[PDB]
Design a protein around this ligand. Sequence first.
Ligand SMILES: *[C@@H]1O[C@H](CO[C@@H]2O[C@@H](C)[C@@H](O)[C@@H](O)[C@@H]2O)[C@@H](O[C@@H]2O[C@H](CO)[C@@H](O[C@@H]3O[C@H](CO)[C@@H](O)[C@H](O)[C@@H]3O)[C@H](O)[C@H]2NC(C)=O)[C@H](O)[C@H]1NC(C)=O
Ligand SMILES: CC[C@H](C)[C@H](NC(C)=O)C(=O)N[C@@H](Cc1ccc(O)cc1)C(=O)N[C@@H](Cc1ccc(O)cc1)P(=O)(O)O
Ligand SMILES: *[C@@H]1O[C@H](CO)[C@@H](O)[C@H](O)[C@H]1NC(C)=O
Ligand SMILES: [Cl-]
Ligand SMILES: [Cl-]
Ligand SMILES: [Zn+2]
Length: 581
Amino acid sequence: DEAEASKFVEEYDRTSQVVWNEYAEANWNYNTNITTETSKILLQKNMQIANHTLKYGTQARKFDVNQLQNTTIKRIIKKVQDLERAALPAQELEEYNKILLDMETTYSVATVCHPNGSCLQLEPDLTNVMATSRKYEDLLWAWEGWRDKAGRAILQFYPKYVELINQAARLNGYVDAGDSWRSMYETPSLEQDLERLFQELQPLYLNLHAYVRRALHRHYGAQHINLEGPIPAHLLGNMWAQTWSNIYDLVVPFPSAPSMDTTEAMLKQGWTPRRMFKEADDFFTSLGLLPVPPEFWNKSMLEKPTDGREVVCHASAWDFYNGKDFRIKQCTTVNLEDLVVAHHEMGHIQYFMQYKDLPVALREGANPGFHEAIGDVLALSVSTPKHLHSLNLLSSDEHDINFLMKMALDKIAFIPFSYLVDQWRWRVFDGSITKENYNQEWWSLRLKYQGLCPPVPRTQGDFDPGAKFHIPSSVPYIRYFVSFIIQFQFHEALCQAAGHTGPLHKCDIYQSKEAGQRLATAMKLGFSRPWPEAMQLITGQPNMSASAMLSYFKPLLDWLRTENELHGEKLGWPQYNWTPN
Ligand SMILES: *[C@@H]1O[C@H](CO[C@@H]2O[C@@H](C)[C@@H](O)[C@@H](O)[C@@H]2O)[C@@H](O[C@@H]2O[C@H](CO)[C@@H](O[C@@H]3O[C@H](CO)[C@@H](O)[C@H](O)[C@@H]3O)[C@H](O)[C@H]2NC(C)=O)[C@H](O)[C@H]1NC(C)=O
Ligand SMILES: CC[C@H](C)[C@H](NC(C)=O)C(=O)N[C@@H](Cc1ccc(O)cc1)C(=O)N[C@@H](Cc1ccc(O)cc1)P(=O)(O)O
Ligand SMILES: *[C@@H]1O[C@H](CO)[C@@H](O)[C@H](O)[C@H]1NC(C)=O
Ligand SMILES: [Cl-]
Ligand SMILES: [Cl-]
Ligand SMILES: [Zn+2]
């Protein structure tokens, strides 16, 4: 029984390489060239990969996993028994694939237009407005417009999507799609684990929220900001108020210690998207990690085409299942934000290259959070004033608190957002949230976790979750919450491995071969072992922990508490029922 099992795995892995490589090609071709033709080829390749999955999945289910000796074979066969969407009947499957395509296409081609003439796309036009405008009504136009055009358009598809993804989940042995998604972590205590981590970051978030709220009150006026209520969702510098770094200039702790305009610096010095990815490549190689192949530079789409082409702009990293072909697809803007994004995506590429010699079933991160965390770890060092000054993008305790605030606006603000997205989706999937209250429940969570309110009352027909990429694209989100916790654990451990002393936020692991080695050994494991092993290899312990993130921001927590107390802030939003009058 063991001999037939390993033979099966061998056959599965060699055939999967071929069909998945074919599928990836067609998917890439659509993502980088949205047309009726590339659509039809993709949907046809969807049938082909479903045929393969069904064939091998059906075989896999005939194995009694319980009777298998080898644990690696056991692990692979167990995973192949999950057919995903391929479990659906033929008619259901073609409908599901069409629904996903329609949702993705709708989101990626959505535009917000001025009556007079000009039509804005999310990247870069609406993103730029949200980042730079300091005018209440202009931010409102972009915020509401995006939700009116992208969000509302997704609503027609979503209930059927939910029905089909849940049906597929049940046919694969889960109770619903959220159950299926959570299972990717192989952690029965996941929901409690994440709840505890969220709670530990409360003091930091609430203090940041209160301080930022006070600064908004100062700029946007007392009539538009309730100092005891939620913050209007359009004022945080980001379409989804998920990260707040673009309003740094409104909240800077010590304006007497000014920072160099990084965007202006990058543009004047002739940075290009290509150069940004080259700098990311250099950072990885400085650690002794792998360079991207020449093929990467030849085949990647690192900027929005002027080709006339319609594309999916949202940054992604692609593994073509042949151990040679790895690509990034990103509509890169020349700014600091996208330089960080470039590092993030390059971390995904590094992961692909590190586990390329494993059987494809195990060519995944230790858990999806790990995959998201790699690039972010390096980006933490990239972001240090020391490293930015070395890149000629920047030029005391004041600057120190300023830096920590800047980092908090990104990292701390994202904690509740990244937590809530799948809190909402899991309840959609399990039936707790029906289509009659999709939006109402979304805003309940936006209030409960983030302390945000919508600037304009929502109406029936609104589907604000549809205005966030991962919703119509069916991309799980809890990975980003996990990523943000564990990236600081990795940072702390790699900094210690690099022999750095002093405050964690001052550490820069550039050129540390000891740091590179720890990351490499963990990444090489792919999905071959439960994630605590990869955690152990990097950090010397097996748990997720908020401690490293708390240690990193400790000096900011102290300053924020002092600042908030002297201004008499009431932390939180006890008047949670407050909305803009
Ligand atoms: C359980 O089975 C796994 C996997 O076995 C492999 O895949 C099967 C489908 C069959 O085709 C097998 O013939 C095949 O070995 C075993 O894990 C494997 O162990 C070997 C030996 O330790 C690893 O080989 C190493 O590979 C590196 C890089 O190529 C070399 O530098 C090393 O010197 C060494 O040869 C191999 O990588 C590893 N494979 C995986 C996927 O982990 C495992 O040993 C076995 N368990 C037991 C208890 O027997
Ligand atoms: C259609 C192929 C996918 C685009 C790709 N998968 C492969 C095998 O290439 C993939 O899942 N890539 C992940 C990063 C990631 C990669 C592998 C993982 O196991 C987990 C995450 C990725 O690019 N995520 C991005 C978001 C995204 C995720 C999935 C998508 O289909 C499109 C976009 P990011 O979080 O960097 O902004
Ligand atoms: C875009 O798609 C069309 C078919 O729809 C194809 O002929 C064309 O070559 C594609 N463009 C590029 C740049 O590949
Ligand atoms: Cl929203
Ligand atoms: Cl996930
Ligand atoms: Zn990512």
